[PDB]
Each structure stands twice: as C-alpha cells, then as structure tokens.
Amino acid sequence: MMIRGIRGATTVERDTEEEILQKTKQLLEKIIEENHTKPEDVVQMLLSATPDLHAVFPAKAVRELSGWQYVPVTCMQEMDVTGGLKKKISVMMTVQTDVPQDQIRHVYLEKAVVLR
Amino acid sequence: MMIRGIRGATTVERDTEEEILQKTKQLLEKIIEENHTKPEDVVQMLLSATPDLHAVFPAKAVRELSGWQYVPVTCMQEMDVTGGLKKKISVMMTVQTDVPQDQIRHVYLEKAVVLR
Amino acid sequence: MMIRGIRGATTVERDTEEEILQKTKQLLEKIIEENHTKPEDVVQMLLSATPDLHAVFPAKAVRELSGWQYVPVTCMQEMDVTGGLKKKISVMMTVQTDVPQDQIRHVYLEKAVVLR
C-alpha cells in the first residue's frame, strides 16, 4: 500500500475569481484524467498561490467537480522568490496508487509550462 | 492500508499567545476525540494561520497533549484572500485509518463555523 | 503499510542562492543518511522558508541529489511569528517506512539546533 503525491501548476493572467476558478478547475481536471484519479483514493490536497493572488480561494473550483466534497483541502501561500513565476497556483495532491513514481503524470499548464 | 487527512479550523479574537494556544488546543482535542485519533497513527500535521497572527507558533499547544512529542508538525502561512475569514488557524492532520472518507469528522470551531 | 513524516530545519546567514542551496542540500543529505531514505519510498516533500529568504527556491538543491527527479516537491512560506527563528528553511518529508514514530531521526542544523 503506497501513497504518492501528484504535482501540478498553472498561471492566471488577471487576479479575478472567474479566471482563477476556471484555470484551477482546468488543472485539476487534467491531473484527474491523466492519472485516472478517483476522489476516494485521495488522502488530501494542498493548493497554493503566489502572494499576488487575492481574489478567491482556489479550493472553490473543487465544488464543480463530481464527488469531491469529502476530499480535505487547505490553501497555502507559496514562497516569494525574486524572479520566480508570478500569479501561479500549485497543486500537491496526495493519492493512493500502485503506479510507480517515475510514471506519475504531473500537470503543468499555461505559463507554468516552463517548469515541467 | 489507507491514509486520510482530517481538516479543522478555528478563530481567535485577539493575537495573543494565550488565546492562540487555548483555541488551537481546543481544536485538536475536538479532532482527536471526534476521530478517536492515537498519536502513533498520525503521519504528520500541518498547522496554518492567516497573515494577521504573529504572537506564537500554534504548534506550541501540542506540548500540552499526552503522548504527541514524536508527531512531526510544521507551521505555514495561509493564503491571504481579500474578504476571507481573518485570524484563522487551520489543521491538516494526516492519519492512518480504515474509516471511509465520507465518515471522517472534520472540526470547525468559533467563527470558522461558517465554513463547515 | 505505514507512512511517516520526517522533519528538518536549518538556517542561512545571508539570503543568497549559493548558501541557501548549500545548506538545504546539507540538510537533506543528513535526513537521507540518518533515516536511510530511498527516493522511491518518498511520497512527497514540503520545503518552507521564513519571509526573509527570496534568493532562490530551496527545491533547486534537490537537483544535485542522485535519483530524486521524480519526487514531487513544493515550496511554501512559513508562518511569521514575532521573535521566531529568522532565515529558516524547513523540511517535511513524507516517506514510507516500518520504523516506529519514536525512532524517526529528525534533523536540526545550524541555528535551528535550538529547536531540536
């Protein structure tokens, strides 16, 4: 019985609830489809954003997913490193899976493509 | 063998070591009793606070619990979203348990009741 | 099948990429050797720094380790408590192991020695 973390990241152009929820939602849908993740297999989820996003808690996008209301999620503030990717939201999803570490499909979207 | 995250949250009226330790302690006692959590089953713990609390590390309350000295705990700063719940402390306890996701008893106290 | 978190912490004298990468690297090498940690057993890793470090993402040190490219890592900002240890970087490594909680070797280096 193994537990694995699945990373993910994306960026928004403007700090607005609308775009934040849309792209956070898109990121999670990509992770879920790429890894075939069932909500019950998920231990917890950690969402984070750089200190320039204040419009809404990215976790709000999880409400539009099907069957994820029982997945515990908390939202943290990412480290502010001078010169780093701005307006970025990250995902650290902990899931149960027998799929090898080297095979986990981590998702990097938008301007966060320069990290993957 | 499954691992589950248990969420929790509370708020303090004033930024003081005394009230922070008291309510953080009360929150953890509620989580522990509601979920029947033994310290040895706990993988790790993540404590967080909004950027308006600076009086003390909430982790200091763990010292008054019985048999929890070996549980790894780190304290993070929560995301600052305009209009969110102020003076809030959160808990993301990762524990070992066969109890189904839909049955985990997440604890929301004080002004954090508006989230549960 | 049990999952355990291994804590760690250190401090840097100056906010520079060079010293940050060196000491973060030294910290992880100490944790890995003290606990005999294989990269494949690691679920995920959480790196954090106090709000006074901006020179680089501590995760950059992981690139010099052997066989750790598939270990998911995210970097968070630690809670700013007045009077706390400044210029500190922490580690919350989640690993698979049958070694008892009371036996896990948590690593505290540099000025972070006052915490262990």
Side-chain angles (χ1 to χ4, degrees), chain A residues 1-115, chain B residues 1-115, chain C residues 1-115:
Chain A
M1 267 291 246
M2 200 48 190
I3 299 295
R4 296 284 178 203
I6 309 181
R7 210 182 189 281
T10 185
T11 60
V12 292
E13 181 71 16
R14 294 179 180 203
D15 183 33
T16 60
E17 186 181 333
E18 298 69 60
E19 189 179 359
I20 287 173
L21 293 191
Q22 174 188 256
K23 293 186 180 187
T24 296
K25 176 185 170 58
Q26 191 64 71
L27 180 57
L28 297 160
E29 290 180 323
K30 249 298 176 179
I31 292 183
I32 299 158
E33 70 165 67
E34 291 295 331
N35 299 269
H36 307 119
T37 313
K38 303 170 181 60
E40 58 242 46
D41 296 344
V42 182
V43 172
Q44 61 195 56
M45 191 157 77
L46 255 28
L47 270 36
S48 60
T50 43
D52 49 18
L53 302 177
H54 309 277
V56 68
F57 280 112
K60 204 180 178 186
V62 168
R63 296 148 69 149
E64 303 176 56
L65 295 173
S66 176
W68 279 61
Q69 64 173 346
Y70 293 127
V71 181
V73 179
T74 176
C75 314
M76 254 98 91
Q77 201 204 278
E78 202 178 87
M79 193 189 305
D80 193 38
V81 171
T82 58
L85 228 193
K86 313 287 276 299
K87 310 184 189 307
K88 182 180 65 182
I89 295 162
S90 293
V91 172
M92 180 58 74
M93 194 189 284
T94 308
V95 311
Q96 171 200 269
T97 181
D98 58 18
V99 179
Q101 185 175 73
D102 57 289
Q103 288 188 74
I104 300 304
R105 310 274 296 166
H106 302 275
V107 179
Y108 298 98
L109 277 15
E110 297 302 323
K111 295 180 61 185
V113 73
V114 67
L115 293 314
Chain B
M1 267 291 246
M2 200 48 190
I3 299 295
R4 296 284 178 203
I6 309 181
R7 210 182 189 281
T10 185
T11 60
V12 292
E13 181 71 16
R14 294 179 180 203
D15 183 33
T16 60
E17 186 181 333
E18 298 69 60
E19 189 179 359
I20 287 173
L21 293 191
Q22 174 188 256
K23 293 186 180 187
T24 296
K25 176 185 170 58
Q26 191 63 71
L27 180 57
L28 297 160
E29 290 180 323
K30 249 298 176 179
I31 292 183
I32 299 158
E33 70 165 67
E34 291 295 331
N35 299 269
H36 307 119
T37 313
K38 303 170 181 60
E40 58 242 46
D41 296 344
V42 182
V43 172
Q44 61 195 56
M45 191 157 77
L46 255 28
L47 270 36
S48 60
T50 43
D52 49 18
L53 302 177
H54 309 277
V56 68
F57 280 112
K60 204 180 178 186
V62 168
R63 296 148 69 149
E64 303 176 56
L65 295 173
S66 176
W68 279 61
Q69 64 173 346
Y70 293 127
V71 181
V73 179
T74 176
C75 314
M76 254 98 91
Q77 201 204 278
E78 202 178 87
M79 193 189 305
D80 193 38
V81 171
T82 58
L85 228 193
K86 313 287 276 299
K87 310 184 189 307
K88 182 180 65 182
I89 295 162
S90 293
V91 172
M92 180 58 74
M93 194 189 284
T94 308
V95 311
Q96 171 200 269
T97 181
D98 58 18
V99 179
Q101 185 175 73
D102 57 289
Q103 288 188 74
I104 300 304
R105 310 274 296 166
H106 302 275
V107 179
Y108 298 98
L109 277 15
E110 297 302 323
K111 295 180 61 185
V113 73
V114 67
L115 293 314
Chain C
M1 267 291 246
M2 200 48 190
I3 299 295
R4 296 284 178 203
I6 309 181
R7 210 182 189 281
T10 185
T11 60
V12 292
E13 181 71 16
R14 294 179 180 203
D15 183 33
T16 60
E17 186 181 333
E18 298 69 60
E19 189 179 359
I20 287 173
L21 293 191
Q22 174 188 256
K23 293 186 180 187
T24 296
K25 176 185 170 58
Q26 191 64 71
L27 180 57
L28 297 160
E29 290 180 323
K30 249 298 176 179
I31 292 183
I32 299 158
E33 70 165 67
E34 291 295 331
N35 299 269
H36 307 119
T37 313
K38 303 170 181 60
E40 58 242 46
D41 296 344
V42 182
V43 172
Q44 61 195 56
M45 191 157 77
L46 255 28
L47 270 36
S48 60
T50 43
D52 49 18
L53 302 177
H54 309 277
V56 68
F57 280 112
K60 204 180 178 186
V62 168
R63 296 148 69 149
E64 303 176 56
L65 295 173
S66 176
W68 279 61
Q69 64 173 346
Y70 293 127
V71 181
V73 179
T74 176
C75 314
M76 254 98 91
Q77 201 204 278
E78 202 178 87
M79 193 189 305
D80 193 38
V81 171
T82 58
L85 228 193
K86 313 287 276 299
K87 310 184 189 307
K88 182 180 65 182
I89 295 162
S90 293
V91 172
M92 180 58 74
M93 194 189 284
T94 308
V95 311
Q96 171 200 269
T97 181
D98 58 18
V99 179
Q101 185 175 73
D102 57 289
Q103 288 188 74
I104 300 304
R105 310 274 296 166
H106 302 275
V107 179
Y108 298 98
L109 277 15
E110 297 302 323
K111 295 180 61 185
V113 73
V114 67
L115 293 314

